[PDB]
Amino acid sequence: PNKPLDIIVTFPPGGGTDMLARLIGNYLTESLGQTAVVENRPGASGNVGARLVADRAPDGYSLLMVNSSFAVNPGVFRNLPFDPKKDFAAVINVAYVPSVFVVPAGSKYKTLGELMAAAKQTNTQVTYGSCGNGTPQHLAGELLNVSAKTHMVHVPYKGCGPALNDVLGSQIGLAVVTASSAIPFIKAGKLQALAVTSKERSALLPEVPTVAEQGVAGYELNQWHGLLVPGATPMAVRQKLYDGIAKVMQRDDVQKKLADLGYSTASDGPEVFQKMVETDIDRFSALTKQIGLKVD
């Protein structure tokens, strides 16, 4: 590393992806001795930032901060301006966060099972908010529909903040948002959590069951957050970046901060993370093909 790194964030400030990129950038600047400049390029669900990095030199100085949305995009954009498998190479996955099905304090829905019963029939009017059209949160509700054979109607919000405001005020009866956004409200008893979308609980919500354990067997949709580089970046460079970032993630202060927020820390490396990206691309594409979703 001999000039600044340029870390391009696919989502705007206020969300977990930007938070983690800026947390990494902060400690990376400290170590290895050049500014890791962090910048948000969030246009078209991260596609603007992705195309930008796809076109940078494969030298390790240009990185893309992603979440699972990156794997959703190939299935929901008609004409993606890059090859989401070939044009990127994974460096590190640093954190998971489950989604959570949340309802207002005093909602008639006491369990996920009650919600699914309410939404079993076709025409029907059980709406759920999400963090946005084509988000992993949106797809968590659609996956439940497909897996549980229910008919909940998706109402998108511009991020988790606005979705939470409407469930907080009972303007909508239900939303799917990230655990990290929702946890303070759930602890405060302003919201109730019906399920988490990970394979196992949560950690900060030990009394909230997974969707799978309620029982929609095989259901999971955990959002990852990590860094990619241009597809041709040699493995030695990916490993050098990996080593540095993993050292940041290993910090006590970093681990505590994330855990307190409801992030599950991770450190999947170049090979493992690359496999996860490609596997999720395939899986999400299959789901959004079933439900017929295009975002453009």
UniProtKB/TrEMBL annotation:
Record's keyword annotation contains Signal: yes
Family of this protein: Belongs to the UPF0065 (bug) family.
Disulfide bonds: C131-C160
Organism of origin: Bordetella pertussis (strain Tohama I / ATCC BAA-589 / NCTC 13251)
Protein name per UniProt: Exported protein
Keyword set, alphabetical order: Signal
Keyword Secreted: no
SUPFAM superfamilies: Periplasmic binding protein-like II
PROSITE patterns: PROKAR_LIPOPROTEIN
Highest rank taxon of the organism: Bacteria
